[PDB]
Structure 1
Amino acid sequence: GSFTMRLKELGEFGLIDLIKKTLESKVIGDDTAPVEYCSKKLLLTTDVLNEGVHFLRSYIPEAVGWKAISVNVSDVIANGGLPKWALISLNLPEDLEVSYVERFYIGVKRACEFYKCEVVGGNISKSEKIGISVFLVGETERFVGRDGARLGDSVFVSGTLGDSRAGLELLLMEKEEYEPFELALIQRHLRPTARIDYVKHIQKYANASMDISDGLVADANHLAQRSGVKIEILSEKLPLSNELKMYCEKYGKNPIEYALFGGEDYQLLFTHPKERWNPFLDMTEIGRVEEGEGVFVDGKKVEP
């Protein structure tokens, strides 16, 4: 035995901080990395999907391809940008069916057409399990990160919350038959759609923005932390879908818990004066930026 500090002890964000300092980096910290180029800003970002962690080999491949692109396009949109070019690095087992990869890219192709971006390259390496690393390049006239929230700002989110988590739980049940609303939830988990419809809004009005990937509470703390402010959320303001309620009804669950802690919805979390609100978009006011520290819900403070 020797005892040496391991990554596990440091923790995810502790490691990122170490990386940021070692690099003496000033840009690291947001969903994307803004770089100055031709009077505009290019946004560089990357996400990963590993077999056994974010999907199973039994998952429909085209959906996995759709998701791989969507997941990263989500970061770009959350920071006020439009996707442009992407590369996909694949770690593949030599026993995998050729049709799997082909179908994965069919899903990638459809997502790219939908988001109006393009996969221009990538890499292939041999491995035990499937690993998917996506690199995306986007552009914007105004980058919006996690540290620009202003006190008095209202806190917004897009769509509904908790759907993805319920979808995953339903998939885990491995039932041989699901009801329509259950398939809807499963589809939302398996095939999320990045809110590319919010780009202009974020780019023009948000003071602080990011996408909800790990859950509202957890991601709201990063926002509150980087903006050095306090976030007060009202549970009864959380946008809930009928399918989620139906799910929580059938399995004796509490919707609010799914809305606050459910991950992988890939909706947006942004802030700005309530007056900038756009009723044409499905945004919902759920709280506000108050001078202070931490994230509070109905008064009590909740940590990630």
Structure 2
Amino acid sequence: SFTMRLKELGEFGLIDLIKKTLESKVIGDDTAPVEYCSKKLLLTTDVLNEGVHFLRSYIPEAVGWKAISVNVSDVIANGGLPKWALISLNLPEDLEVSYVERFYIGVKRACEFYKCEVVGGNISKSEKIGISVFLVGETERFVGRDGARLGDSVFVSGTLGDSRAGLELLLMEKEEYEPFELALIQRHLRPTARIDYVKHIQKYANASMDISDGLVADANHLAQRSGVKIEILSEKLPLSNELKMYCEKYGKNPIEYALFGGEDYQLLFTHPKERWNPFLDMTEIGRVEEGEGVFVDGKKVEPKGWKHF
């Protein structure tokens, strides 16, 4: 047999093939805009698979919180507010009910914090834990990742690389972790969607999305969709103290974690610096110019990222 597999096709070839097979024009952003009653509902889905996004050994509460968060992150990144959610679960017959009870308590906590509601879902048995959450968002103004203008400044929220450091910390399987380390582990396990940026993005963002697979990588989605070149400056990337602590203590380059670190779930949006709002952890990292691709310090850059295939 010589017929092509997904491994050979790659995630981006897969995505393009589905879009083309569906002949859909509404698709390529973090959510799917859909007009309704003059307003625009934002639809999005996300999965967390055991062994792929988390391990059964993790604290279920954190996974339930995260299952909602990463999804709220997509709704927020396009300028919308989370409303209703559905959860589709693949659970092994031998799973502890306490794991599921606790998981949902994490779900409840997140929804109460993001102010959305889990109105239903689905159950099915399976070999391993599968968590698929669907989210419905409401928004006055949709903000894709294609409207970036030239000259615009490139801003990110929070700090980067923390999550990748937290994941490596989790893999060490230590019995005890130092306070700064738990902070990082914290960011990987219970990420928090920047739902506090809705107002801002929805009003002053020309283009926006959330960093989920790594800055450099997702930056390419932005550049491509909009049709510009992304000029990023490493020594302007918001780094974390605990991240620097982890890097000092373990011998790694912080920059390396901020450019190619995943699951940070911060935002990536562009707009005129004249629209900057100092009352938010906003951090300009680069500029939108003519050309194509993403340049870190005026250079190539692989890039590296997550990619399932």
TM-score tier (shorter): over 0.9
Shift of 1:154: 0.1
In structure 2, stretches of 5+ residues that fail to align are: 304-309
Alpha-carbon separation, structure 1, partners of 2:302 and 2:270? 20
**What does 1:91-240 correspond to in 2, within 5 Å?**
91-240=90-239
Decide whether the 8 Å contact of 1:221 with 1:303 is kept in 2: no
Alpha-carbon separation, structure 1, partners of 2:240 and 2:230? 23
Alpha-carbon separation, structure 1, partners of 2:245 and 2:57? 27
Shift of 1:7: 1.6
Shift of 1:215: 0.5
4+ residue runs over 2 A deviation: none
Q: SS in structure 2 opposite 1:25?
A: coil
Q: Which digits, 9 at most, give the CA deviation of each residue in 1:267-298, with x for residues without a partner?
A: 00000000000000100000000100110011
Decide whether the 8 Å contact of 1:208 with 1:271 is kept in 2: yes
State TM-score, norm by structure 1: 0.99
Q: Which digits, 9 at most, give the CA deviation of each residue in 1:153-208, with x for residues without a partner?
A: 00000000000000001111111111100000001100000000000100001010
- Say how many residue pairs are matched: 303
Q: SS in structure 2 opposite 1:198?
A: helix
Alpha-carbon separation, structure 2, partners of 1:168 and 1:7? 26
Shift of 1:10: 1.4
Decide whether the 8 Å contact of 1:294 with 1:303 is kept in 2: no
Alpha-carbon separation, structure 2, partners of 1:106 and 1:212? 26
Q: Which digits, 9 at most, give the CA deviation of each residue in 1:224-263, with x for residues without a partner?
A: 1111100001111000111000110001111011010110
Shift of 1:101: 0.6
Alpha-carbon separation, structure 2, partners of 1:176 and 1:97? 23
Q: SS in structure 1 opposite 2:230?
A: strand
Alpha-carbon separation, structure 1, partners of 2:245 and 2:7? 38
In structure 1, stretches of 5+ residues that fail to align are: none
Shift of 1:303: 3.3
Decide whether the 8 Å contact of 1:295 with 1:303 is kept in 2: no
Alpha-carbon separation, structure 1, partners of 2:152 and 2:120? 41
Alpha-carbon separation, structure 1, partners of 2:62 and 2:175? 20
Alpha-carbon separation, structure 1, partners of 2:282 and 2:135? 26
Q: SS in structure 2 opposite 1:301?
A: coil
**Counterpart in the other structure of 1:32:** 31
Alpha-carbon separation, structure 2, partners of 1:173 and 1:6? 33
**Counterpart in the other structure of 2:299:** 300
Q: Which digits, 9 at most, give the CA deviation of each residue in 1:21-44, with x for residues without a partner?
A: 111101011110000000100000
Alpha-carbon separation, structure 2, partners of 1:28 and 1:8? 23
Q: SS in structure 1 opposite 2:169?
A: helix
Alpha-carbon separation, structure 1, partners of 2:82 and 2:284? 27
Q: SS in structure 2 opposite 1:201?
A: helix
Q: SS in structure 2 opposite 1:300?
A: coil
Alpha-carbon separation, structure 2, partners of 1:203 and 1:138? 13
State TM-score, norm by structure 2: 0.97
Per the alignment, do residues 210 and 239 of structure 1 end up closer, same or farther by CA in structure 2, a change over 3 Å counting? same
Q: SS in structure 2 opposite 1:44?
A: strand
Q: Does 1:80 align with 2:58?
A: no
Q: Which digits, 9 at most, give the CA deviation of each residue in 1:108-138, with x for residues without a partner?
A: 0000000000000000001000000010000
**Counterpart in the other structure of 1:241:** 240
